[PDB]
Amino acid sequence: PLKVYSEDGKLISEFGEMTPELNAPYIAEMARAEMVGRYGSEAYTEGYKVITTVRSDLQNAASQSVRDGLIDYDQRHGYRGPETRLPGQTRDAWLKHLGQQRSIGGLEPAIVTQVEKSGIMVMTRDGKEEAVTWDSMKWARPFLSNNSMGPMPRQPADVAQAGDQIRVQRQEDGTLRFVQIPAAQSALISLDPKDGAIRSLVGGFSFEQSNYNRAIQAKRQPGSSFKPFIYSAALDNGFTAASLVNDAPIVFVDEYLTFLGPIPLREALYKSRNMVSIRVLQGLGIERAISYITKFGFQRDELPRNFSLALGTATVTPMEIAGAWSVFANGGYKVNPYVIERIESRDGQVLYQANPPRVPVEPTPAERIIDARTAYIMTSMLQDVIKRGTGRRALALKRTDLAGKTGTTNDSKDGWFSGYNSDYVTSVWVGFDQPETLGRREYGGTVALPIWIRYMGFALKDKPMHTMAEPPGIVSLRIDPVTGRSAAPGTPGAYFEMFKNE
Ligand SMILES: *C(=O)[C@H](CO/N=C(\C[C@@H](C(=O)O)N1C(=O)c2cc(O)c(O)cc2C1=O)C(=O)O)NC(=O)/C(=N\OC(C)(C)C(=O)O)c1csc(N)n1
């Protein structure tokens, strides 16, 4: 009977062929699959022991973050009604129905037994009847469309009726809050950028729903969370953090066989200026870009061979994105994300000890793909996204070492946040499986970034500031904001900027 364990030693699950301390089904499945590829059906029989890269504390932080974040978003959009309406049915029968219902993401099924002007009485699977306050029901305004909502409910009867099958969430003070299972989905992945080990993975709201692992299976458009790769290529192909690029509309042609306006490359990056991103790619040329980009972990077959590439219209997985961002985090090295740390035998003999490519402090040396100075300047700029840009909500963590980037696809069809420090790389996706707008007022920063912040808050709790150390070969010089070139003394507006020795 296959036993899957976390790095810290907690039992995730067991697999066999004809009690979990840590709930990590997405991780569990990844191990089961990997083991089967390695040993066959004999993996389930022999009693092997798999030791994963995940840490229990971090795993539950991820789990909670995604759940809370999906619930927060869901409520903002209203109530979509009960799961079942069982009026006139006996308590014994209600208990019968409830018996075949399961908890989905800490959200327990309950049947409304009574509706009072003060609240509701609900029965759980156990048969226990408990009160639910009108306060926890006040949010339950009618959902009409991802953009339209009904009026605020004025009494519990407006929201629920006896026989209604609802959801209740227990709190730290034993009380039950009136909830609903979100229709939106999310994906969280956190890595150690040193070797590419997955420290936490969440492939949806509940495995307890579908077994689909959106962290590794779902290919979504990264939008602006992709720009760094274009800008990194820029820094490595003639441009500088100072390079002035006109943010203005782009006229275009086909011929046989926007404010700001001209701004520094750094300004454009934290400000997600698409016109700049197009012009940079233009100068770089599609091919050169793709060849540079793929080296980060992306597949040539996912990268659009046109202008749209600059806008992040590629189809990628949160694991691919996280794997790639790790390049900037670890100072320029390609790491291969992994989940099996150890495979032990029946008796305890070590059958497998993962030796991944590792960044410098026998182990496999990690290949360097980009200039250490590139990784440093790139980090510098991406920290501004938190400091000045779209990541201002992440300043709440009171940390200096944070670098990141929000991403919002057209019509808010996807919401992203990808970021790090030298400790962890965390990639957060939010959206609908069948794409639809998350809402007019919804962005990567309003859906994903909150989840990300919650998780990074916990992960980096007792962690001191850890950013990349300045590598040899960087120079900070005064620049004329108007010319983008070295500023003579007495230049108004002159500012300092880092550069690779020209
Ligand atoms: C990058 O993803 C690029 C720019 O938009 N990116 C983000 C949204 C963000 C911002 O641009 O700063 N943002 C707003 O525009 C905005 C307006 C507003 O009134 C309030 O209150 C807040 C915000 C806000 O946070 C980001 O997360 O970084 N996006 C795109 O290029 C694509 N679509 O753009 C829109 C704006 C979402 C759109 O509907 O057109 C895109 C890239 S691939 C694809 N299919 N679309």
Side-chain angles (χ1 to χ4, degrees):
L2 187 72
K3 285 163 232 79
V4 188
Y5 289 103
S6 61
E7 226 191 21
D8 44 22
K10 311 258 185 290
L11 183 90
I12 294 153
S13 80
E14 299 208 14
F15 302 83
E17 196 163 71
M18 308 191 200
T19 309
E21 299 167 302
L22 176 68
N23 142 86
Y26 287 108
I27 280 308
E29 241 309 304
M30 290 174 76
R32 187 221 46 96
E34 274 208 52
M35 283 304 284
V36 155
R38 204 181 295 258
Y39 298 103
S41 52
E42 221 207 54
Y44 309 121
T45 78
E46 298 287 284
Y48 285 101
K49 272 188 272 89
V50 213
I51 292 85
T52 57
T53 57
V54 298
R55 273 194 70 224
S56 81
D57 53 318
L58 296 188
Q59 188 39 233
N60 312 116
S63 289
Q64 206 180 291
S65 292
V66 180
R67 285 186 279 188
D68 306 331
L70 273 174
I71 298 173
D72 286 355
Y73 163 86
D74 187 70
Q75 291 191 177
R76 284 210 291 273
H77 293 271
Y79 183 65
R80 297 163 296 110
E83 297 182 358
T84 341
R85 292 167 183 281
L86 296 192
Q89 255 140 276
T90 173
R91 181 246 183 196
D92 271 21
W94 279 350
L95 225 16
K96 188 233 173 82
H97 172 82
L98 233 38
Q100 288 308 107
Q101 300 303 123
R102 270 162 79 257
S103 277
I104 313 297
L107 272 32
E108 302 132 83
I111 301 294
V112 184
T113 75
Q114 262 164 292
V115 189
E116 220 288 299
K117 217 106 178 287
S118 49
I120 56 158
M121 274 306 277
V122 291
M123 182 187 63
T124 19
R125 223 175 308 170
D126 40 45
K128 218 273 170 187
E129 222 177 297
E130 303 172 53
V132 170
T133 53
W134 163 233
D135 136 82
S136 64
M137 298 182 79
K138 285 163 168 155
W139 71 273
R141 76 187 293 176
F143 162 97
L144 307 166
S145 104
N146 282 122
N147 275 122
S148 61
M149 254 167 284
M152 283 296 281
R154 312 150 296 157
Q155 56 170 320
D158 286 325
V159 179
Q161 286 173 320
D164 273 15
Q165 155 145 323
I166 61 123
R167 290 281 163 180
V168 282
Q169 165 193 77
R170 194 104 55 198
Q171 319 293 96
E172 241 152 319
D173 56 294
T175 50
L176 290 171
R177 290 277 256 171
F178 184 90
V179 281
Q180 138 174 271
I181 277 147
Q185 280 304 291
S186 178
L188 196 154
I189 190 161
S190 189
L191 300 173
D192 180 41
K194 306 154 209 291
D195 52 24
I198 297 156
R199 302 298 186 202
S200 55
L201 196 145
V202 170
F205 179 78
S206 242
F207 196 83
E208 306 117 83
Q209 283 160 322
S210 87
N211 82 322
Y212 189 58
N213 191 319
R214 299 153 183 82
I216 76 189
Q217 284 170 269
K219 267 173 79 203
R220 307 289 281 207
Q221 284 184 26
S224 307
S225 77
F226 191 79
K227 298 192 187 300
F229 311 109
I230 303 296
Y231 291 62
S232 191
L235 290 195
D236 281 7
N237 288 104
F239 295 84
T240 69
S243 292
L244 275 158
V245 189
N246 176 43
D247 179 52
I250 306 153
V251 203
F252 61 77
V253 315
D254 50 337
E255 26 49 89
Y256 213 81
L257 167 124
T258 312
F259 2 69
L260 290 210
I263 53 165
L265 216 86
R266 176 186 282 264
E267 194 180 331
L269 184 55
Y270 81 90
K271 279 182 173 183
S272 277
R273 308 304 301 161
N274 288 309
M275 296 323 247
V276 180
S277 317
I278 291 158
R279 292 192 167 89
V280 172
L281 176 55
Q282 220 273 322
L284 243 43
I286 300 304
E287 188 55 31
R288 184 164 294 286
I290 295 168
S291 296
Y292 184 92
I293 324 288
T294 54
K295 296 172 175 185
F296 283 77
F298 306 110
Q299 312 274 271
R300 209 174 274 262
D301 55 276
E302 299 174 325
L303 300 179
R305 262 201 74 87
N306 82 307
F307 85 95
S308 84
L309 174 81
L311 322 157
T313 72
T315 50
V316 280
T317 79
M319 190 162 74
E320 297 189 288
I321 281 139
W325 277 73
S326 305
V327 186
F328 304 128
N330 66 45
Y333 304 94
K334 170 75 172 71
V335 291
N336 304 334
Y338 76 102
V339 74
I340 295 168
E341 187 72 75
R342 238 177 303 131
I343 296 153
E344 269 161 43
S345 66
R346 223 190 280 96
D347 94 275
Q349 192 182 232
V350 179
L351 252 140
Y352 177 79
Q353 177 47 72
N355 188 0
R358 200 172 279 94
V359 316
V361 211
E362 270 273 73
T364 303
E367 178 171 81
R368 170 171 287 278
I369 58 154
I370 68 143
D371 200 315
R373 302 170 296 169
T374 305
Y376 184 81
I377 312 151
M378 272 297 315
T379 296
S380 185
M381 297 185 282
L382 299 166
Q383 283 177 78
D384 285 4
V385 181
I386 292 106
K387 285 201 255 268
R388 310 181 62 178
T390 26
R392 270 171 280 164
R393 303 176 153 85
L395 297 159
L397 295 184
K398 318 289 182 159
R399 292 196 68 97
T400 60
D401 60 342
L402 307 191
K405 196 90 199 73
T406 37
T408 318
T409 54
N410 149 68
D411 244 81
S412 315
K413 284 200 209 230
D414 306 285
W416 292 91
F417 201 75
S418 257
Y420 62 97
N421 79 317
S422 306
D423 293 325
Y424 313 106
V425 172
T426 310
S427 206
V428 175
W429 167 86
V430 172
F432 289 106
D433 314 307
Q434 287 294 288
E436 292 148 66
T437 170
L438 288 153
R440 242 252 36 113
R441 296 134 105 264
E442 297 296 354
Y443 313 91
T446 75
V447 294
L449 176 62
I451 295 175
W452 188 102
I453 293 159
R454 195 206 273 269
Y455 177 74
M456 293 296 269
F458 175 91
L460 303 160
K461 199 184 168 283
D462 307 311
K463 294 279 198 160
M465 314 298 108
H466 188 17
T467 157
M468 192 186 148
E470 195 179 353
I474 286 156
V475 275
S476 215
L477 38 152
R478 270 272 216 77
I479 291 302
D480 188 349
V482 196
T483 83
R485 309 168 265 153
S486 258
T491 303
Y495 75 89
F496 285 97
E497 189 64 82
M498 48 181 58
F499 299 92
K500 290 196 256 178
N501 314 343
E502 303 290 56

Coordinates of all heavy atoms in Angstrom, one line a residue, residues 215-283:
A215 N -2.9 23.6 -11.4 CA -1.5 24.2 -11.2 C -0.5 23.7 -12.2 O 0.5 24.3 -12.4 CB -1.1 23.8 -9.8
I216 N -0.8 22.5 -12.8 CA 0.1 21.8 -13.7 C -0.6 21.4 -15.0 O 0.0 21.1 -16.0 CB 0.7 20.6 -13.1 CG1 -0.2 19.4 -12.9 CG2 1.4 20.9 -11.7 CD1 0.3 18.3 -12.1
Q217 N -2.0 21.3 -15.0 CA -2.7 20.9 -16.2 C -3.3 22.1 -17.0 O -3.3 22.1 -18.2 CB -3.9 19.9 -15.9 CG -3.4 18.5 -15.7 CD -4.6 17.7 -15.1 OE1 -4.8 17.6 -13.9 NE2 -5.4 17.1 -16.1
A218 N -3.9 23.1 -16.3 CA -4.6 24.2 -16.9 C -3.6 25.2 -17.6 O -2.8 25.8 -16.9 CB -5.4 24.9 -15.9
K219 N -3.8 25.4 -18.9 CA -2.9 26.3 -19.7 C -3.7 27.6 -19.8 O -4.6 27.7 -20.6 CB -2.6 25.7 -21.1 CG -1.2 24.9 -21.0 CD -0.9 24.1 -22.4 CE -0.4 25.0 -23.5 NZ -0.6 24.3 -24.9
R220 N -3.2 28.6 -19.1 CA -3.9 29.9 -19.2 C -3.0 31.1 -19.8 O -1.8 31.0 -19.8 CB -4.6 30.3 -17.9 CG -5.5 29.3 -17.3 CD -6.9 29.1 -18.0 NE -7.8 30.1 -17.7 CZ -9.2 30.0 -17.8 NH1 -9.7 28.8 -18.1 NH2 -10.0 31.0 -17.5
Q221 N -3.7 32.2 -20.2 CA -2.9 33.4 -20.7 C -2.4 34.2 -19.5 O -3.2 34.6 -18.6 CB -3.8 34.2 -21.6 CG -4.0 33.7 -23.0 CD -4.7 34.7 -23.9 OE1 -4.7 35.9 -23.7 NE2 -5.3 34.2 -24.9
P222 N -1.0 34.3 -19.4 CA -0.5 35.0 -18.2 C -0.6 36.6 -18.2 O -0.4 37.2 -17.2 CB 1.0 34.6 -18.3 CG 1.2 34.5 -19.8 CD 0.0 33.9 -20.3
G223 N -1.0 37.1 -19.4 CA -1.1 38.6 -19.6 C 0.2 39.3 -19.2 O 1.2 39.0 -19.7
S224 N 0.1 40.3 -18.3 CA 1.2 41.1 -17.9 C 2.2 40.4 -17.0 O 3.3 40.8 -16.9 CB 0.7 42.4 -17.2 OG -0.2 43.0 -18.0
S225 N 1.7 39.2 -16.3 CA 2.6 38.5 -15.5 C 3.7 37.8 -16.3 O 4.7 37.3 -15.7 CB 1.8 37.5 -14.6 OG 1.3 36.3 -15.3
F226 N 3.6 38.0 -17.6 CA 4.6 37.5 -18.6 C 5.6 38.5 -19.0 O 6.8 38.2 -19.3 CB 3.8 37.0 -19.8 CG 4.6 36.2 -20.8 CD1 5.0 34.9 -20.5 CD2 5.1 36.7 -22.0 CE1 5.7 34.1 -21.4 CE2 5.8 36.0 -22.9 CZ 6.1 34.7 -22.6
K227 N 5.3 39.8 -19.1 CA 6.2 40.9 -19.5 C 7.6 40.8 -19.1 O 8.5 40.9 -19.9 CB 5.6 42.3 -19.1 CG 4.3 42.6 -19.8 CD 4.0 44.1 -19.7 CE 2.6 44.4 -20.2 NZ 2.5 44.1 -21.7
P228 N 8.0 40.4 -17.8 CA 9.4 40.3 -17.4 C 10.3 39.6 -18.4 O 11.3 40.2 -18.7 CB 9.3 39.5 -16.1 CG 8.0 39.9 -15.5 CD 7.1 40.3 -16.6
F229 N 9.8 38.5 -18.9 CA 10.6 37.7 -19.9 C 10.9 38.5 -21.2 O 12.0 38.4 -21.6 CB 9.8 36.4 -20.2 CG 9.5 35.7 -18.9 CD1 8.2 35.6 -18.5 CD2 10.5 35.2 -18.1 CE1 7.9 35.0 -17.2 CE2 10.2 34.6 -16.8 CZ 8.9 34.5 -16.4
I230 N 10.0 39.3 -21.7 CA 10.2 40.2 -22.8 C 11.3 41.3 -22.3 O 12.3 41.5 -23.0 CB 8.9 40.9 -23.4 CG1 7.9 39.8 -23.8 CG2 9.2 41.9 -24.5 CD1 8.3 38.9 -25.0
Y231 N 11.0 41.9 -21.2 CA 11.9 42.9 -20.7 C 13.3 42.4 -20.3 O 14.3 43.1 -20.6 CB 11.3 43.7 -19.6 CG 10.1 44.6 -20.0 CD1 9.0 44.1 -20.6 CD2 10.2 46.0 -19.8 CE1 7.9 44.9 -21.0 CE2 9.1 46.8 -20.2 CZ 8.0 46.2 -20.7 OH 6.9 47.0 -21.1
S232 N 13.4 41.1 -19.9 CA 14.7 40.5 -19.5 C 15.5 40.3 -20.8 O 16.7 40.6 -20.8 CB 14.4 39.2 -18.8 OG 15.6 38.6 -18.3
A233 N 14.8 39.9 -21.9 CA 15.4 39.7 -23.2 C 15.9 41.1 -23.7 O 17.0 41.1 -24.3 CB 14.3 39.1 -24.1
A234 N 15.1 42.1 -23.5 CA 15.4 43.5 -23.8 C 16.8 43.9 -23.2 O 17.7 44.2 -23.9 CB 14.3 44.5 -23.3
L235 N 16.9 43.7 -21.8 CA 18.1 44.0 -21.1 C 19.3 43.2 -21.6 O 20.5 43.7 -21.6 CB 17.9 43.7 -19.6 CG 17.0 44.6 -18.8 CD1 17.3 44.3 -17.3 CD2 17.2 46.1 -19.0
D236 N 19.1 42.0 -22.1 CA 20.0 41.1 -22.7 C 20.2 41.4 -24.2 O 21.0 40.7 -24.8 CB 19.7 39.7 -22.4 CG 20.2 39.4 -21.0 OD1 20.6 40.3 -20.2 OD2 20.2 38.1 -20.6
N237 N 19.5 42.3 -24.8 CA 19.6 42.6 -26.3 C 19.6 44.0 -26.7 O 19.0 44.4 -27.7 CB 18.6 41.7 -27.1 CG 19.0 40.2 -27.2 OD1 18.4 39.4 -26.5 ND2 20.0 39.9 -27.9
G238 N 20.4 44.8 -26.0 CA 20.6 46.3 -26.4 C 19.9 47.3 -25.5 O 20.3 48.4 -25.5
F239 N 18.8 47.0 -24.8 CA 18.1 47.9 -24.0 C 18.7 48.0 -22.6 O 19.4 47.1 -22.2 CB 16.6 47.5 -23.9 CG 15.8 47.6 -25.2 CD1 15.9 46.5 -26.1 CD2 15.0 48.6 -25.5 CE1 15.1 46.5 -27.2 CE2 14.2 48.6 -26.7 CZ 14.3 47.6 -27.5
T240 N 18.3 49.1 -21.9 CA 18.7 49.3 -20.5 C 17.4 49.7 -19.7 O 16.4 50.2 -20.2 CB 19.8 50.4 -20.3 OG1 19.3 51.7 -20.7 CG2 21.0 50.1 -21.1
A241 N 17.5 49.7 -18.3 CA 16.5 50.1 -17.4 C 16.1 51.6 -17.6 O 15.2 52.1 -17.0 CB 16.9 49.8 -16.0
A242 N 17.0 52.2 -18.4 CA 16.9 53.7 -18.7 C 16.3 53.9 -20.0 O 15.8 55.0 -20.3 CB 18.2 54.3 -18.5
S243 N 16.5 52.9 -21.0 CA 16.0 53.1 -22.4 C 14.7 53.7 -22.5 O 13.7 53.2 -22.0 CB 16.0 51.7 -23.1 OG 17.3 51.2 -23.3
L244 N 14.6 54.9 -23.2 CA 13.3 55.6 -23.4 C 12.6 54.9 -24.6 O 13.2 54.6 -25.6 CB 13.6 57.1 -23.7 CG 13.7 58.0 -22.4 CD1 14.4 59.3 -22.7 CD2 12.3 58.3 -21.8
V245 N 11.3 54.6 -24.3 CA 10.5 53.9 -25.3 C 9.1 54.6 -25.3 O 8.5 54.7 -24.3 CB 10.2 52.4 -25.2 CG1 9.5 51.8 -26.4 CG2 11.5 51.6 -24.9
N246 N 8.7 55.1 -26.5 CA 7.5 55.9 -26.7 C 6.2 55.0 -26.5 O 6.0 54.1 -27.3 CB 7.5 56.6 -28.0 CG 6.2 57.3 -28.4 OD1 5.6 58.0 -27.5 ND2 5.8 57.2 -29.6
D247 N 5.5 55.3 -25.3 CA 4.2 54.6 -25.0 C 3.2 55.5 -25.8 O 3.0 56.6 -25.4 CB 3.9 54.7 -23.5 CG 2.6 54.1 -23.1 OD1 2.3 52.9 -23.5 OD2 1.8 54.7 -22.3
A248 N 2.8 55.0 -27.0 CA 1.9 55.7 -27.8 C 1.2 54.7 -28.8 O 1.8 53.6 -28.9 CB 2.7 56.7 -28.7
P249 N 0.1 54.9 -29.4 CA -0.5 54.0 -30.3 C 0.4 53.5 -31.4 O 1.3 54.3 -31.8 CB -1.8 54.7 -30.8 CG -2.1 55.7 -29.8 CD -0.8 56.2 -29.3
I250 N 0.2 52.3 -31.9 CA 1.1 51.8 -32.9 C 0.3 51.6 -34.2 O -0.6 50.7 -34.2 CB 1.8 50.5 -32.5 CG1 2.6 50.7 -31.2 CG2 2.7 49.9 -33.6 CD1 2.8 49.4 -30.4
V251 N 0.7 52.3 -35.2 CA 0.0 52.1 -36.5 C 0.7 50.8 -37.1 O 1.8 50.6 -36.9 CB 0.2 53.3 -37.5 CG1 -0.9 53.3 -38.5 CG2 0.3 54.6 -36.7
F252 N -0.1 50.1 -37.9 CA 0.5 48.8 -38.5 C -0.1 48.6 -39.9 O -1.1 49.1 -40.3 CB 0.3 47.6 -37.6 CG -1.2 47.3 -37.3 CD1 -2.0 46.7 -38.3 CD2 -1.7 47.7 -36.1 CE1 -3.3 46.5 -38.0 CE2 -3.1 47.4 -35.8 CZ -3.9 46.8 -36.8
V253 N 0.6 47.7 -40.7 CA 0.3 47.4 -42.1 C 0.4 45.9 -42.4 O 0.9 45.1 -41.6 CB 1.2 48.2 -43.1 CG1 1.3 49.7 -42.7 CG2 2.6 47.6 -43.2
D254 N -0.1 45.5 -43.6 CA 0.0 44.1 -44.1 C 0.3 44.2 -45.6 O -0.5 44.8 -46.3 CB -1.2 43.2 -43.8 CG -2.5 43.8 -44.1 OD1 -2.6 45.1 -44.2 OD2 -3.5 43.0 -44.3
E255 N 1.5 43.8 -46.1 CA 1.9 44.1 -47.4 C 2.7 43.1 -48.4 O 3.9 43.3 -48.6 CB 2.8 45.4 -47.4 CG 3.4 45.8 -46.1 CD 4.3 44.8 -45.3 OE1 5.5 44.7 -45.6 OE2 3.7 44.1 -44.4
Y256 N 2.0 42.1 -48.8 CA 2.6 41.2 -49.8 C 3.8 40.3 -49.5 O 4.2 40.2 -48.3 CB 2.9 41.9 -51.1 CG 2.7 41.1 -52.3 CD1 1.4 40.9 -52.8 CD2 3.7 40.4 -52.9 CE1 1.2 40.1 -53.9 CE2 3.5 39.6 -54.0 CZ 2.3 39.5 -54.5 OH 2.1 38.7 -55.6
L257 N 4.3 39.5 -50.4 CA 5.3 38.4 -50.2 C 6.0 38.5 -51.6 O 7.1 38.9 -51.7 CB 4.7 37.0 -49.9 CG 5.7 35.9 -50.0 CD1 5.7 35.1 -48.7 CD2 5.3 35.0 -51.2
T258 N -2.9 56.3 -26.5 CA -2.1 55.8 -25.4 C -1.1 56.8 -24.9 O -0.1 57.1 -25.6 CB -1.5 54.4 -25.8 OG1 -2.5 53.6 -26.3 CG2 -0.9 53.7 -24.6
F259 N -1.3 57.3 -23.7 CA -0.6 58.3 -22.9 C 0.9 58.0 -22.5 O 1.5 57.1 -23.1 CB -1.4 58.7 -21.6 CG -2.7 57.9 -21.4 CD1 -2.7 56.5 -21.1 CD2 -3.9 58.5 -21.6 CE1 -3.8 55.8 -21.0 CE2 -5.1 57.7 -21.4 CZ -5.1 56.4 -21.1
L260 N 1.4 58.8 -21.6 CA 2.7 58.7 -20.9 C 3.8 59.6 -21.3 O 4.2 60.5 -20.4 CB 3.1 57.3 -20.5 CG 2.3 56.7 -19.3 CD1 3.2 55.8 -18.5 CD2 1.8 57.7 -18.3
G261 N 4.3 59.7 -22.6 CA 4.2 58.8 -23.7 C 5.6 58.1 -23.8 O 5.7 57.1 -23.2
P262 N 6.7 58.8 -24.3 CA 8.0 58.2 -24.2 C 8.5 58.1 -22.8 O 8.5 59.1 -22.1 CB 8.9 59.0 -25.1 CG 8.2 60.3 -25.2 CD 6.7 60.1 -25.0
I263 N 8.8 56.9 -22.3 CA 9.2 56.6 -20.9 C 10.3 55.6 -20.7 O 10.5 54.8 -21.6 CB 7.9 56.0 -20.2 CG1 7.2 54.8 -20.9 CG2 6.9 57.1 -19.9 CD1 6.3 54.0 -20.2
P264 N 11.0 55.5 -19.5 CA 12.0 54.5 -19.3 C 11.5 53.1 -19.2 O 10.4 52.8 -18.7 CB 12.6 54.8 -17.9 CG 11.6 55.6 -17.2 CD 10.9 56.4 -18.3
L265 N 12.3 52.1 -19.8 CA 11.9 50.7 -19.8 C 11.4 50.2 -18.4 O 10.4 49.5 -18.3 CB 13.1 49.8 -20.2 CG 12.7 48.6 -21.0 CD1 12.7 49.0 -22.5 CD2 13.8 47.5 -20.8
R266 N 12.0 50.6 -17.3 CA 11.6 50.3 -15.9 C 10.2 50.9 -15.6 O 9.4 50.1 -15.1 CB 12.6 51.0 -14.9 CG 12.3 50.8 -13.5 CD 13.2 51.5 -12.5 NE 14.4 50.9 -12.3 CZ 14.7 50.0 -11.3 NH1 13.7 49.8 -10.4 NH2 15.9 49.5 -11.1
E267 N 9.9 52.1 -16.0 CA 8.6 52.7 -15.8 C 7.5 51.9 -16.5 O 6.5 51.6 -15.9 CB 8.5 54.2 -16.3 CG 7.3 55.0 -15.8 CD 7.2 56.4 -16.3 OE1 8.3 57.0 -16.6 OE2 6.1 56.9 -16.4
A268 N 7.7 51.5 -17.7 CA 6.9 50.7 -18.6 C 6.6 49.4 -17.9 O 5.4 49.0 -17.9 CB 7.5 50.5 -19.9
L269 N 7.6 48.7 -17.4 CA 7.5 47.4 -16.7 C 6.5 47.5 -15.5 O 5.4 46.9 -15.6 CB 8.8 46.7 -16.5 CG 8.7 45.3 -15.9 CD1 7.9 44.4 -16.7 CD2 10.1 44.7 -15.7
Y270 N 6.9 48.2 -14.5 CA 6.0 48.3 -13.3 C 4.6 48.9 -13.7 O 3.6 48.5 -13.1 CB 6.6 48.9 -12.1 CG 6.7 50.4 -12.1 CD1 5.6 51.2 -11.5 CD2 7.8 51.1 -12.5 CE1 5.7 52.6 -11.5 CE2 7.9 52.5 -12.4 CZ 6.8 53.2 -11.9 OH 6.9 54.6 -11.9
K271 N 4.5 49.7 -14.7 CA 3.2 50.3 -15.1 C 2.5 49.5 -16.1 O 1.4 49.9 -16.5 CB 3.4 51.8 -15.6 CG 3.5 52.8 -14.5 CD 3.6 54.2 -15.0 CE 3.5 55.2 -13.8 NZ 3.5 56.6 -14.3
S272 N 3.0 48.3 -16.5 CA 2.3 47.3 -17.5 C 1.9 48.0 -18.8 O 0.8 47.8 -19.3 CB 1.1 46.6 -16.8 OG 1.4 45.5 -16.1
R273 N 2.8 48.9 -19.4 CA 2.5 49.7 -20.6 C 2.6 48.8 -21.8 O 3.8 48.5 -22.3 CB 3.4 50.9 -20.7 CG 3.3 51.8 -19.4 CD 1.9 52.3 -19.0 NE 1.3 53.0 -20.1 CZ 0.0 53.2 -20.1 NH1 -0.8 52.7 -19.2 NH2 -0.6 53.9 -21.1
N274 N 1.5 48.2 -22.4 CA 1.5 47.3 -23.5 C 2.1 47.9 -24.8 O 2.8 47.2 -25.5 CB 0.1 46.9 -23.8 CG -0.5 46.0 -22.8 OD1 0.2 45.0 -22.5 ND2 -1.7 46.2 -22.4
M275 N 2.0 49.2 -25.0 CA 2.6 49.8 -26.2 C 4.1 49.7 -26.2 O 4.7 49.5 -27.2 CB 2.1 51.3 -26.4 CG 0.6 51.3 -26.7 SD 0.0 49.9 -27.7 CE -0.4 50.7 -29.1
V276 N 4.7 49.9 -25.0 CA 6.1 49.7 -24.8 C 6.5 48.3 -25.1 O 7.4 48.0 -26.0 CB 6.6 50.2 -23.4 CG1 8.1 50.1 -23.3 CG2 6.1 51.6 -23.2
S277 N 5.9 47.3 -24.4 CA 6.1 45.9 -24.6 C 6.1 45.5 -26.1 O 7.0 44.7 -26.4 CB 5.1 45.1 -23.8 OG 4.9 45.7 -22.5
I278 N 5.2 46.0 -26.9 CA 5.1 45.7 -28.3 C 6.4 46.2 -29.1 O 7.0 45.4 -29.8 CB 3.8 46.2 -29.0 CG1 2.5 45.3 -28.5 CG2 3.9 46.1 -30.6 CD1 1.2 46.0 -28.7
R279 N 6.7 47.5 -28.8 CA 7.9 48.1 -29.4 C 9.2 47.4 -29.0 O 10.1 47.3 -29.9 CB 7.9 49.6 -29.0 CG 6.8 50.4 -29.7 CD 7.0 51.9 -29.5 NE 6.1 52.7 -30.4 CZ 4.9 53.1 -30.1 NH1 4.4 52.8 -28.9 NH2 4.1 53.7 -30.9
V280 N 9.3 46.9 -27.8 CA 10.5 46.3 -27.3 C 10.7 45.0 -28.1 O 11.8 44.7 -28.6 CB 10.5 46.1 -25.8 CG1 11.7 45.2 -25.4 CG2 10.6 47.4 -25.1
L281 N 9.6 44.2 -28.2 CA 9.5 42.9 -28.9 C 9.8 43.2 -30.4 O 10.6 42.4 -31.0 CB 8.1 42.2 -28.8 CG 7.9 40.9 -29.6 CD1 8.9 39.9 -29.2 CD2 6.5 40.4 -29.3
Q282 N 9.3 44.3 -30.9 CA 9.5 44.7 -32.3 C 11.0 44.8 -32.6 O 11.5 44.2 -33.5 CB 8.8 46.1 -32.5 CG 8.1 46.2 -33.8 CD 9.0 46.7 -34.8 OE1 9.9 47.5 -34.5 NE2 8.9 46.2 -36.0
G283 N 11.7 45.5 -31.7 CA 13.1 45.8 -31.8 C 13.9 44.5 -31.7 O 14.8 44.3 -32.4

